[PDB]
Nucleic acid binder design. Structure first.
Lengths: 370, 370
RNA sequence: CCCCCCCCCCCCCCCCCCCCCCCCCCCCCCCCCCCCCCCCCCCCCCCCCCCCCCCCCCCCCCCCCCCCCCCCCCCCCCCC
């Protein structure tokens, strides 16, 4: 029969990669700091010091942010997530030791984490510069409140909030979203910026952009931290910020998949076009594949997953054009750097999409009027 | 087919968070006091001492309130709810020891709980100041009745009654409801304020506001206590008041969800508007998601649950406007700090909603008249 | 290379208390068993017999095209 001549390449390609006999393990490096729950409270203090510091140096805040995320996970878990990702990890412990150094003649004590990635010499400078800003703050308002100080439990998550904004715009993969990351960090997190002088969206976002670029394994650590953080029963409003901002990243690097359902929902006439209908057999395979993966496919582009290319609709020129045209006519895209392969289908879809959104008459058949 | 091009993001996002391989555990601190049933009666006495004290210092009453709630749960259960919430707990026992101290020269005995969070030095001062108010009360009325004294079993729940009022207005998350908490504590719980001089709604509410802010894990303990308290077969009228005041918190931080059903019930014409109907596919998903969760979604904003953002209708500008307008026209909102994204839909919905509530004619078809 | 060790607190015990006590042999009857009839077997009958190797042709496969991605967006706020 002619019904039998078929070949499910999409399912077979997945079967090949899923049943690999051998494994590659990428060079994570010489060592990774794996802090446990006992240090979490010290890192939150370190995160607070950077936040209270006016015009703070956020060169290490991307790294310090990851240390807080790993301390929340705990040494056992964060090692487990690195090994499950596919990395040989040389686990370095993290705890508190008292360092004595004579700054400006007078001998001073400092509680420092003995980290491999972060030197004890730069850790004291974060505390030194924070004490300067603290006494300046204390001189201005007399008594500093619990909100404005570094001891607040939000401090650690406040730094991870803009980390979730950075992870939201990692799909582009060229620090192009930085403008949107800062923009949202002013619309969102506005109360937090009032109570902390050193909440600099541009400076902190670039730090997280740097640490995710330099260390691709830490983006896997943050994503699985964010999912673990979002799996909790309840916390604070700042943790509610992080959870909401983190879930905005879900479905990044695959907007054409969502806009394709929109074109189907609004019933754009150019979907029924002949050349678009020729592709419909294969576009359903990727949508069914997206339905198969489920929640797993959300961070397939944020984490540069090999199977992220399978979710692409760009391989279908005609369907992509009408979907990208529908988005243009409804006026939801811009400045989206996706170009339609078929320009005629794009313009026709844009024209009909503009006609769909016109005027606004009341539909009385929807209501249960007697 | 074009019916297959779909993607249930709401269900897949839940599937991602529900199937997390790893877990985060937040720094609960150095230690938590986990009192058992044997101390419950001592804390009730301590709660009574604060209530009989005229112009009492309710600095520790928020913490003392949590200790009574945890004593009612019992060491085994309160440890279980902290671990299920996602917290590493260092359980400190709570029981009675006799402390001898010479106040004003004369050596005096005091039954004190050896708590970590509460010092033995401040515990005796609660008893000392209560004895002053007790003898002043005894001098005025001669013989103090069972209602006015600290030994009454209601004392512990009376302090937790305004804790339920604080939890009712935690959705705002900025002590803005304090005015309403004091207001309702005067309308309801009025008989209790007559029999206790130290029932200060403003002072006690601020104490619970402080302890929930400083310790986010205790708000999880109180919510699960209130549900466990509400699951009882029956009790006193004060316990009945607490159960009623606690269930008023159910559905906090999601009033737009309830007002949306009201607009559908009253049949506001602006629901059938074109731009509102475009959102109807996605607004049903969140209502069906709210129906899926059931009783679990009640305290999703009180407990700052990551999945609380999923219940938001604010993401839909047009539907939110007509729903917020319907509430304005019926005259049920105010001073609600929610602003409509679409002003024209809000005004049109408000206008029709005002026309719905006019006059009042008798409908004789409703009755079974022969 | 570096480096004594040690250091507190503390007899134990203490009360109350014999046990036992009654009633009661057992058994007793009836009753050998068996008994008859009866060897078994007997016939007929080797089996087999023919025909027949199998195989034989034709034929590498393959060859094109193609990263992906890029937008926007915390939530909440009343009353009871």
């Amino acid at each position: 029969a002619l019904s039998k001549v078929k070949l499910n390449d999409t399912l077979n390609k997945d079967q090949l990669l899923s049943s690999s006999k051998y494994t590659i393990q990428r060079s994570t490096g010489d060592s990774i700091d794996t802090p446990n729950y006992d240090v979490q409270k010290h890192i939150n203090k370190l995160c607070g010091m950077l936040l209270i510091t006016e015009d703070a140096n956020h060169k290490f805040t991307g790294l310090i942010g990851m240390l807080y995320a790993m301390s929340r996970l705990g040494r056992e878990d964060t090692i487990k997530i690195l090994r499950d990702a596919g990395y040989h990890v040389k686990a370095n412990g993290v705890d508190v030791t008292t360092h004595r150094q004579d700054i400006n003649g007078k001998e001073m004590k400092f509680e420092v984490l003995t980290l491999a990635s972060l030197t004890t010499e730069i850790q004291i400078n974060i505390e030194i510069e924070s004490r300067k800003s603290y006494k300046k703050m204390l001189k201005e308002m007399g008594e500093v409140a619990p909100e404005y100080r570094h001891d607040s439990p939000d401090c650690g998550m406040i730094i991870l909030c803009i980390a979730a904004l950075v992870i939201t715009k990692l799909a582009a993969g060229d620090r192009s979203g930085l403008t949107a990351v800062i923009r949202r960090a002013n619309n969102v997190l506005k109360n937090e910026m009032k109570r902390y002088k050193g909440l600099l969206p541009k400076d902190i976002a670039n730090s997280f952009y740097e640490v995710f670029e330099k260390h691709p394994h830490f983006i896997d650590v943050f994503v699985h931290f964010g999912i673990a953080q979002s799996s909790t029963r309840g916390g604070s409003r700042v943790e509610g910020i992080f959870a909401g901002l983190f879930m905005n990243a879900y479905g990044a690097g695959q907007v054409m998949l969502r806009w394709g359902v929109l074109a189907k929902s609004v019933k754009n006439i150019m979907l029924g076009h002949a050349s678009v209908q020729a592709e419909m057999e294969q576009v359903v395979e990727v949508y069914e594949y997206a339905q198969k993966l489920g929640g797993e496919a959300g961070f397939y582009h944020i984490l540069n997953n090999p199977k992220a290319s399978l979710l692409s609709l760009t391989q279908f020129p005609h369907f992509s054009s009408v979907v990208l045209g529908n988005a243009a006519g409804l006026g939801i895209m811009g400045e989206y750097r996706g170009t339609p392969r078929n320009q005629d289908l794009y313009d026709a879809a844009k024209a009909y999409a503009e006609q769909l959104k016109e005027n606004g008459v009341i539909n009385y058949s929807v209501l249960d009027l007697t």
